Paper text:
AtzD catalyses the hydrolytic ring opening of CA to yield 1-carboxybiuret which then spontaneously decomposes to biuret and carbon dioxide. Herein, we describe the first X-ray structure for this family, an unusual concatenated knot fold (which we term the ‘Toblerone’ fold), that possesses a threefold rotational symmetry that extends to the active-site architecture. The AtzD monomer is a unique arrangement of a core of 12 β-strands with six helices on the outside. This structure is formed from three ‘repeating units’ (RUs) that share the same structure as one another; they have been designated RU A (residues 3–104), B (residues 113–250) and C (residues 256–364). Structural, mutagenesis and biochemical studies suggest that AtzD, and the other members of the Toblerone fold family (TrzD and Bar), are lysine-serine hydrolases.
A phosphate ion was found in a polar, positively charged cavity in the AtzD monomer, making several hydrogen bonds with the protein. This cavity contains three lysine/serine dyads (Lys42, Ser85, Lys162, Ser233, Lys296 and Ser344) any, or all, of which could plausibly form the catalytic site. AtzD possesses a single metal binding site per monomer, in RU C, for which there is no equivalent in the YgjF family of proteins, but which is completely conserved in 90% of the AtzD homologues currently available (data not shown). The metal binding site consists of backbone carbonyls from residues Ala347, Gln350, Pro352, Gly355, the δ-carboxylate of Glu298 and a water molecule. The octahedral co-ordination, electron density and B factor associated with the cation suggest that the metal bound by AtzD is likely to be magnesium. Anomalous scattering data show that the native metal ion is either magnesium or sodium. However, it is certain from these data that the density found is not Zn2+, nor is it any other transition metal. The metal appears to stabilize an extended loop that contains residues that make polar contact with amino acids in the adjacent RU, which may stabilize the β-strand that holds Lys296 in the active site and contribute to the stability of the enzyme more generally. In addition, this highly ordered structure orients Glu348 in an interaction with Arg195, which sits in the active site.
Numbering used by the authors:
A (entry chain B), B (entry chain A), C (entry chain B), D (entry chain A): 0 to 363
């Protein structure tokens, strides 16, 4: 488990656009067989009926499938695809492509460097979403991803991305047909339950929350339970959980590092600046050292931001995660200089209530 | 309890428009002091952040307050205001004004005529919404309204309209502060719980459902529990339930009658036609005998309509009640010839699952 | 130009679902090489940022590309793909697959039978959308499609479907870079201009409107100019026009016929019934003879439906075409018994203002 | 023209909430008769069908009408009501109340202080919206407001707020009935034309743009024409323009000052910080000296922000002004510490294209 990790941020002109990926392959900057993960922001609504996520995955998988002579559905078992919908405000649609090669023999860099690992859970029954089985299967996968990454301790883990399912009327009906009530009958609400249970699974694996407290009733109820490393995104496009663990290793030769922090609320640009500063990026001209920023955002569940009422949870036209992405995307863009950053909404049990974890990948 | 009921359908050019009501008063067609209820369709989204409902009520109450020399808030205790938001598709914003006078001392033939009565519940605590207290307080109010209407038996009851509250983040927080979790933390979902509990309250009062089955867990879970007379509408503009009971009486002298039926699903125009036909209205040129139609509509919770998948419960841009109003508004309009009809979304425990009750008021 | 046409309506569980098409191929009901057109309803918003249309096309093209050993982009030059987004209310997502074979030698059926032909225009410059070039290139394509169909006269033409482009900010900027103002700077409005110019192109080819009147200024301004056969759908997924001409021929051996009519407004179910009746379908049990219904719907541009104000053109949350599809989908569903029908919004110069053309394909 | 201006920022729990205003009156902090303007942020969609703006005005006017013994409609001729809808992201609904008294007869130091003046135009015909008449009538009103404010020169003018009308289907039909086509047939687009023409009117009055260039065709086409002081907001609730001119005067005794600047784009928090700094506010604990911030925001019409594509003008679910308010609200909140600030969307001819003017009122 000694690797060289490459990370590329590539613009997308639309959800099905693979021209940027093709360019990386054609110019020899990446080998198709080395790609281990793709984290995307796609311009659908990021909620239940967002098929831009599935479409992006389909086109990426087809693209790599051609180069590898594999069917797309096989590529999806090989590569961790995490498509986060919703690019509101200044958020600019893009992919972050992660490639993994054996570590360079020429030993060795001056400190720890970027490493990455992936894992998958089994498919979940509808009645398991938002509940114990999702928590525990996720925890297992997180540990597997950490091992796959060669991450020696929790101190060297900086970001855990999870893609998770949601409920549809068909799945709700299937659940009821077996005499099992699902966690909710509202499809939008189901996304929060899925994200939350997945995030608690991360907290379990990382020992940030003791196992004793992770009863079904705690999901979306107990705000004090969280992982400071967790980034969960729900979608209609899958029935299982996909896990990407990102961290640092002595054995890695990557020309990249990662640092993480937590935004105390949706407008906490100060925390983002502090983390960027910690990576030695201390002027606006040094911002180009950042490969990407990955952040969680949410509508504060108490209905207020720094003492002032917000409307994000009472707005029946625009769902709360859409508002939250718009806000945090803008806050982060005001720091780094543009909106081509990964911002994902719904931060249930991810960082503080009303806040969320974030990570920054930068040139070493 | 011997009345003459007048019913007027008046167009609104916007939510605050009282010009039509003023015209009825100025031309002597109605006396302000005789008005007992107003049922409106207002052109907000009909969901959580729809303030067109409150605005319409405020302007109507101010209008009548001037004529009666009362403060608006006093008028609201005197008159049952039920503002149902959401006028999608061909739905045309309007008010239906109900006026009550002592029965007229003159000959009328054999045959029952339109009667109406109103009632109010106490304010509900946030934690009571969607639960036992809402069910039982509603049941009490329904019986009071029936008595107020002079409705002798359940057979002579044709429509029970209820306006009910919903949850906001502030109310959810208040509930939690007393150690009582609310029925849901999703503000949109709370509207369904409120409507559903209120409708079961109606079912209790009318003996359509036995009291034994009305446990909290049955709300939104047990589809087989319903009232065939119930029409419930949730709103941000009130903390209590408002009840209007509409029916028929031998002692009433109204030049109007009412009949009711049930739509088996959102496109069951056939049932609406059958009820209209039962009132002696057969041809298209006899449709002008209808004063108004009042109908409940909903997205079929099994996710299908007559065997075909629908998207109304998986659409994160347009909420299910907006879709349902559009559909049933169109179905009804295709029969009666226009969209100036009362169609209200979310028919939890109101008629069949996926369907809803409706009533027709017509010239005698 | 003597054909046998097969038409299949197949449900979709999501935009990328090709399982139904595969089933038709696997059971020998259709040969991949015989498929000439697919008309789909996909569950995106049907407006500017609907990528469900492109996704559906991509997956269908990939599916057929495998069977034909062709790249998907080649399949799109061979098969006319028309994906109409927006499945509001009871509208059920589906594809209608059209296959064409040489006429059966066993001559010959008792009257004219279903025939079909296709054509494509060149790509349009952004500044050509909504204008003369789009009108005239469309007219050319319509005549080519009619010839391809073996349609002898205009009397035997029953439906002309066109898929057309729209404007994005990038296209608007490109136009301005050449010193040419586009027809509009509003991306949503551009869809109506594209549909309208395309529809007038149809009217030109069919001689329903004289060429003298088709100046640029008439597009979206002169309501009296229209085609009673035209069905136009705009989308982000293409830069050219795709044309499908559907009609009747003596030379065709298809076990199918087509009839067309016009809805005078969005709730004119009566006209739909009349056309269905003309095909010998005269009871509810005979409705299963209908393969599909294809209809245009729109928000009445005068702001009223049968004398009553509507809100479809003043609603900033839900665009007018979404409302219109919900309404007409419901009206038609109330007749045929379900919502798995092709209903497309925005009927500029298509039938009467506020109305639209429709066609019914039924078993002979 | 020698005044003392008081400015109060008061939270609103809903659009009709006047409890905060009542509190200011009851505690003697403001006299009802001294109120000259109210600028509000209301939680409707801020677009065409937002009646929260009218509702807020109605309730404020009714509140003050009671204290002044005037009918509400008379209060609206006395007080400049500017209600800007749309409070997306962290934007917190509130009113800013402006009161004017004769200059206080006491010592104050050297240095200009806050002054304010108001004006109204005549009602506009639908066909005048977005055109010459709106431009020139606005210019007249701006000069009148400046005079009313006692603003000696353009150098002492810091903010010009204008409320302006929009088009509805009824108004479009009325225009066409007189043979005058309106500037657009899209109701949403009409808001931009109204704002733009109004802003150019401000530019005319302030000599930032020469009269020669202000032809009808320049509206929304020529991005190089703008006012750096203009803040225009369109609404359904009025048919005329309302003007508030805010500036500085030697003759004013207000315990307040104002400064203005321009955001180069929607995420230009740096410019906001610079202006705040110029008022002697440097640290986070000095931010409480700011009474309010008033800012214009818009979706960059070239479709990019700092070189990266944005989706705000291609999003058919969420209109561009909603996105823009969310973004700039967040950017500003990240500086001042909360979202209870006036942010208004659609900055056509207001500051740079993609940017907008802003002003800050702070304690002297
Ligand atoms: Mg959180
Ligand atoms: Mg029901
Ligand atoms: Mg038409
Ligand atoms: Mg600007």
């Amino acid at each position: 488990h000694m690797y060289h990790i490459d990370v590329f941020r590539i613009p997308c002109h639309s959800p099905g656009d693979t021209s940027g990926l093709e360019d990386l392959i054609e110019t020899g900057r990446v080998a198709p067989a080395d790609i281990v993960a793709v984290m995307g922001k796609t311009e659908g609504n990021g909620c239940v009926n967002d098929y831009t996520r599935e479409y992006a995955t389909a086109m990426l998988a087809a693209c790599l499938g051609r180069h590898l002579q594999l069917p797309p559905h096989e590529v999806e078992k090989r590569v961790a695809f995490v498509m986060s919908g919703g690019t509101e405000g200044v958020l600019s649609p893009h992919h972050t492509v992660f490639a993994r090669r054996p570590a360079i023999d020429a030993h060795r860099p001056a400190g720890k460097r970027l490493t990455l690992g992936i894992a998958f859970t089994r498919d979940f029954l509808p009645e398991e979403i938002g509940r114990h089985a999702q928590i525990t299967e996720t925890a297992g996968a997180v540990k597997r991803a950490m091992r796959d990454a060669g991450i020696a301790s929790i101190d060297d883990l900086h970001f855990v991305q999870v893609k998770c399912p949601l409920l549809t009327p068909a799945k709700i009906a299937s659940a009821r047909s077996r005499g099992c009530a699902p966690v909710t009958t509202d499809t939008y609400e189901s996304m929060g339950y899925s994200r939350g249970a997945s995030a608690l699974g991360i907290a379990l694996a990382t020992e940030e929350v003791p196992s004793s407290m992770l009863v079904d009733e705690s999901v979306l109820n107990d705000w004090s339970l969280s992982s400071s490393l967790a980034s969960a995104s729900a979608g209609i496009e899958l029935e299982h959980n996909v896990v990407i663990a990102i961290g640092m290793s002595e054995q890695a030769t990557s020309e990249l590092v990662i640092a993480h922090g937590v935004m105390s609320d949706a407008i906490d640009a100060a925390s983002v600046r502090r983390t960027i500063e910690s990576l030695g990026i201390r002027s606006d001209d040094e911002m180009d050292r950042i490969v990407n920023v990955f952040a969680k955002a949410e509508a504060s569940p108490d209905g207020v931001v720094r003492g002032m009422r917000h409307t994000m949870l009472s707005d029946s036209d625009i769902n709360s995660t859409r508002h939250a992405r718009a806000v945090t995307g803008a806050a982060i863009a005001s720091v780094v200089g543009h909106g081509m950053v990964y911002v994902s909404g719904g931060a249930e049990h991810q960082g503080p209530a009303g806040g969320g974890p974030f990570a920054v990948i930068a040139r070493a």
